[model samples]
Target: ASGMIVTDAGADQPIVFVNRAFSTITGYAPNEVLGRNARFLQGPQTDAATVARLREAIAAARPIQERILNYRKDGQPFWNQLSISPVRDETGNVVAFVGVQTDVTA
Candidate 1:
């Protein structure tokens, strides 16, 4: 789970945890992303369709696999191969989202 991040089930979906690999890949330190929405990584070039699909998945409490363009802290673009799953509590209610991201660009 090196390239992992966990976001709370709030309306803003604030980040709670981010692994070291996340910082390495996104060029954002854990402190910078904490309490912030992952949408910060999106730039003008990112595909709207991919973002919409991810939103649909979150709204439906479902898992999602997507590849979207994301910008690093310095505004460098990369192809992000991302997978996110709803984290549920004992009552089967979604409590958070766990996402794994990998940069698939060469």
Candidate 2:
């Protein structure tokens, strides 16, 4: 299933919305996933340098697509095929971000 996540570009960059498929992928309910930073989902094995790229792109309002190992709520790690896009407002300002996720652990 494809998972969908929406987050704000505010200071905290908190998760604002997630679809049912997202909950199914992460084993986290809406309440559990809300008010949290996205990168915190990365597991121990996830490369810091690679994560830096994600952080860089997100901060720069750029699109990024990568596969990273992330752990679910149940402590099971899976390869997350993640795609990110910076959302723009009418004034062309980055107001939010949308992240798409899919489990391609196979």
Candidate 3:
């Protein structure tokens, strides 16, 4: 398989279930990141203010797409392109949110 990872946004900030590809890229077993916020991957260079902005957007029920820095389990930094938007039910009520991330360090 060509280094593709699948993870669930799981109505939470940090994705929950990570596939084998995630481990291959980040060098962290899926178990290690389970139940942990994606912010745990942040390091000294990660933007805290930008993260806050994302939170604000979510709170306001707005969609957002942004790129930010992330750290692997071994502390290697990488740029992550993140796209987040709210999920709505048939009644148009936002029930959850989905976030997709990809490594853009290249």
Candidate 4:
């Protein structure tokens, strides 16, 4: 598991689950990241237009793949190759969004 997150599809889209690799990538423990939006990893250097794209995908409830400069809890920057896709219920209703993160710093 590189980094994974499952967030509820709601007004705030709170993270309901995260994996150990998520802590490894962001230097933030699951306890700290859960119940919060993943954007906490975004910092001043994060590209605004890319974030806007993410907003578009989320608002559209569509799958998207993108990379962004994300900050660790220690304030270090790393490039995260991220993908997000909607999770639907049995009735085909959107219920959650799953996000996968890959650290591509080299």
Candidate 5:
């Protein structure tokens, strides 16, 4: 499976789940990343505007795709081809966010 992370829709946006691929790509164990916001991966070189765009999409409950620089737990940077979409409940209410990450570093 490809990298995937699921976060609750609360204001804190806590990570609730992560696929095995996520640990492989980010060098972070599930236990470490769970209950943390995905932004913990952002590093000094990460683009601020890109993060802003992602935030806007989350705030708007809209799906968005973007390539952003993210750092691994070991502090190595990689280009992440990320796509985030809202996960809705049966009632059509957004209850969470699902983020897909692909490493595009070459």
Candidate 6:
């Protein structure tokens, strides 16, 4: 529970919201990622295979929970407990996505 990062994606990969913990973990503020895609966290060391799988899941609007390798501001590698889930309205309409990013590199 040292720090956390959380982001949400709307339909079509649009970011809906990001929690303050996200900024603390990734050096990005809430304003920086509120309307951006979650992929901004990736770097040279980030695994392309994981990204591809995530992208595919996003395309299908499927929820994903994976421990992915990500990079920090200083290019340090860390394991991220990334969870993205679909948010639906009462009518079963996809309203948005909820992404939770947890930095497990303490």
Worst 10 residues of 4 by lDDT: 10-19
Q: Assess every candidate by TM-score.
A: 0.95, 0.95, 0.74, 0.95, 0.95, 0.80
Badly placed stretches (over 4 Å) of model 3 are 1-14
lDDT of 4 by residue, 10-78 (tens): 877899999889999899988998889889999999999999999999988999999899999999999
Across residues 54-89, which tens digit of lDDT does each residue of candidate 2 receive?
989988889999998999998899999999998998
CA RMSD of all predictions = 1.2, 0.9, 3.4, 1.0, 1.0, 2.5
Top candidate when judged by lDDT against the true structure: 5
lDDT (C-alpha) at residue 104 in model 4: 95
Q: Which regions in candidate 4 have their CA more than 4 angstroms from the true location?
A: none
Q: How many residue pairs clash in each candidate?
A: 0, 0, 0, 0, 0, 0
Which 10 successive residues of model 5 have the least lDDT summed? 1-10
| RMSD in Å for model 3 | 3.4
Q: Which residue ranges in model 5 land beyond 4 Å of their true spot?
A: none
Model 4 error, position 44 (Å): 0.7
Q: Model 1: per-residue lDDT, tens digit, 43-64?
A: 9999999999999998888999
Error of 1 at 104 (Å): 0.2
1 or 3, greater by TM-score: 1
How many clashing residue pairs are found in candidate 5? Answer: 0
The model with the greater lDDT, 3 or 4, is 4
Give the Cα error of residue 49 in candidate 4, in Å. Answer: 0.5
